[PDB]
Each structure stands twice: as C-alpha cells, then as structure tokens.
Structure 1
Amino acid sequence: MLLQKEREEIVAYGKKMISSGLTKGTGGNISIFNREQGLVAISPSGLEYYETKPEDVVILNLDGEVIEGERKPSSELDMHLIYYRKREDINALVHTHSPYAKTIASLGWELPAVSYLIAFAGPNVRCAPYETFGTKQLADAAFEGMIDRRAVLLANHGLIAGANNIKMAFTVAEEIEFCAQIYYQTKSIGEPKLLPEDEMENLAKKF
C-alpha cells in the first residue's frame, strides 16, 4: 500500500488517543503528510480506533481527492488539509476531544502560560470561535487561530495540534491537554501565577 509507514503510525496513535483519555468513541482524528509525494494519510470516519487496521486509513492528495482506500475519510479532512497547503512546518496533526482542553474551549478562553509546558505550543494557545464540525469554515478558523503556534483550541469542540512529525504532534496534544487541566483546576480555586513573555521566549529556545 501507499504510505505504509504512515498508515501504521495512524493506527498506533489513534489507539493511543483512546488509551490516553484524549478522546471518546470515534471522535477526533489523525493525519500524517508525506511531503515527498504530496500525499496525506488520514484516519477513517466513524471507525473504532481499536478496530482500525492500516488498510482502513485513507490516502488523499492535497486537493482532497481519495487516492487509495475504500473507507470514507475523516469528516474533518478539510481542517487537516489546510495546514499541509498553507504552512510548510507541519507534517502531522492530532485532533482530540479531550476534556480539559474542551472545557477551556467551551468558555471561549485562551490558554495562557500557566506552565512551562505551554511552550510545546507557543507562548499561549488561542481559542478559535465556533464553526460547524466538518466544514471549510472550521478549517479556516482552526488554521487562523493556530498561526505561529503548534496547537489551537476549538470552541465547544476540542483541540488540534501539529508538529514536524507524529510523535511530536501527539506530545503537543497530550501536554497541552495537561496544561488545560492545570489551568482549569487553578481557576477553580484561585488565580494562577503565569510565566512572563520573555521566559516563554527563553523556553521556546530551550525546547
């Protein structure tokens, strides 16, 4: 099959999404870009992650046309494709429905520098205002909210994280969910101390 390495990685990390508590049911989705071929591997729509085999992963071109695979691709494919067209620094995307990130997103709040781990995404994580799932409007909002960042919150929906490879993309998703938990819990009982912008700059270097 085409993009065999990518296909296996998508199956592996999809199970890891369920396992890590980063999603419920068949929510969320994962993609990996093969920059040499201009091909995108993406999780299939509505399938259980532990029932998903490499053959079930769908291969698309950057026009969004199916090149290999009989499964329907993720309904959120437009939100994946835009990053592989309009930036060149992202080769893998992890979209989650994780509870603490979705909590902060459902308030419409940004995630500020509550932890040094925020630097996995940038100096902060923005919240993109609501757009209907599976639309080009959501794809545009997600991209715009993530400019010069590796993650963005999606209002009343979840989070998407991107990086140079799938290992780092998953790490950003997991560590930003953890940061959202800390922000949620601190705000429950007080006002968290935040790291200053020059330190976030410093941390960007050290990471």
Structure 2
Amino acid sequence: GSHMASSDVKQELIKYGKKLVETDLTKGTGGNLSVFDREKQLMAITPSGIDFFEIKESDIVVMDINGNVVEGERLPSSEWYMHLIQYQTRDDIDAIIHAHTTYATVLACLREPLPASHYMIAVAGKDVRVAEYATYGTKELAVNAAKAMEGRRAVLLANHGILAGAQNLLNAFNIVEEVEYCAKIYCLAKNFGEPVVLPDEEMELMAEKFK
C-alpha cells in the first residue's frame, strides 16, 4: 500500500508522453518513457502500442530490477529492457525517454554522431554517439544503447531514434528537445557548408557551467 510506484510518477509519465506529441517531437509510435524509483528499485514504464493520448494510469507497467512485472496488466513497452539496463548500470539516471524524433533520427539513419556545432549539446555531453544497430525491442539494442550512452545523457539508435536520460522526466524531456534541436542545426548547417564544431576544452567548460 506504499510498496509500489506512486500515483504521482504514473501521472507524470502520462503528462510527458503527451508533451512529446503536443510539442511535435514525435507522434508517439515506438516511443516510450520510464522512471526508476531508487529507494524501491522499481521501474515504471509506458505500455506497448497504446497511443500516448489514450494511456491511463492503469496501463503503466511497473517492473522490478530484473524485469519482473509487479503492477499492470498491459504489456510493457517493447523497449523496456533498453530502459531497464540503463537503470541497472547507471546511478545518475532516474528517468528515460525514447523517441523517434526528426533530425536526431536522420543522424541515426546515417549512423553519424552529433558534435558540438551548438553549445547546448552540453546537456547531453560533448557529443552524442550512435549505438550499433540492433532490432528494436531486443537485448542487443539494449546493450548497444547502454554502451554508446556511457558518459553521456543521450544516444542515437541506428536507423531508429534517440534515447535520453536524466535525474527526472522534466530534465529527460529537456535533453530530448535540446538534442533534437542541436541535431537539426547540425544537419541544416551541413547542407550549407562546414559546421563549426566547438573544441573539447570549450565543451569541458560548458559541462561545468551547466552543473
């Protein structure tokens, strides 16, 4: 009666699901959100194949650290293990958003990383890497994403989309938004000429300012 993920967290997943569509970051398809409660060691995650605008609190799936479902009758997001393995391996990430955005996914389909052509990428790191390709919803994708997000708060998923993580959903959402913006700026700059990339020293400074 207090042992499971709170109503607050479930409602918040729904809120940010909607925000992703409202701001036109994604239509929702193949996208998913989760939060991890560190005290309880439970992940709450969006369900598979339900439109973001139709998700109810009862559709949220709650899982333990080994992926055993403890609340919810819906099937969890097909990407549940991609989220869970992050929480298993990183203490600095308590909320994750996966989305099929526009320019971030362009870069992912080129299998091209995103460098510091705009300073705001420092919300994720000096750059955003591209994970090795693996089929959606597989262990291979989960592992590939974990590895390529090491030392970063976002990662591109080859031929697929983006994954971002932060301390909470507001910050995770901000990272998705900012990485998508940076991806867009970078791609558009590439059309015109050679984007100027800020040096690592400047990005190291940026990281410290952003704290």
Distance (Å, rounded) in 2 between the aligned partners of 1:22 and 1:128 = 21
The correspondence for 1:175, drawn from 156, 174, 178, is 178
RMSD: 0.9
**2:38 — aligned with what?**
35
Q: Alignment length, in residue pairs? A: 207
The correspondence for 1:74, drawn from 72, 77, 101, is 77
The correspondence for 2:8, drawn from 5, 12, 20, is 5
Q: Is 1:50 aligned to residue 53 of structure 2?
A: yes
Structure 1 runs not aligned, ≥5 long = none
The correspondence for 1:91, drawn from 89, 94, 97, is 94
Please give the TM-score of this superposition, normalised by the length of structure 2. 0.96
> 1:92 corresponds to which letter in structure 2?
A
> 2:105 corresponds to which letter in structure 1?
K
Deviation at 1:18, TM superposition (A): 1.2
**1:126 — aligned with what?**
129
Distance (Å, rounded) in 1 between the aligned partners of 2:27 and 2:135 = 19
**2:141 — aligned with what?**
138
Deviation at 1:25, TM superposition (A): 4.4
Percent identity between matched residues is 52
How big is each residue's C-alpha offset from its partner over 1:183-206, in whole Å with a ceiling of 9 and x where there is no partner? 110001111111111110000011
Q: Is 1:101 aligned to residue 75 of structure 2?
A: no
Q: Is 1:153 aligned to residue 153 of structure 2?
A: no
**1:162 — aligned with what?**
165
Distance (Å, rounded) in 1 between the aligned partners of 2:164 and 2:102 = 15
Distance (Å, rounded) in 1 between the aligned partners of 2:39 and 2:5 = 12
Structure 2 runs not aligned, ≥5 long = none
Go from structure 1 to structure 2 and tell me whether the alpha carbon gap of 1:25 and 1:87 turns closer, same or farther (over 3 Å shift): closer
More moved, 133-142 vs 48-57: 48-57
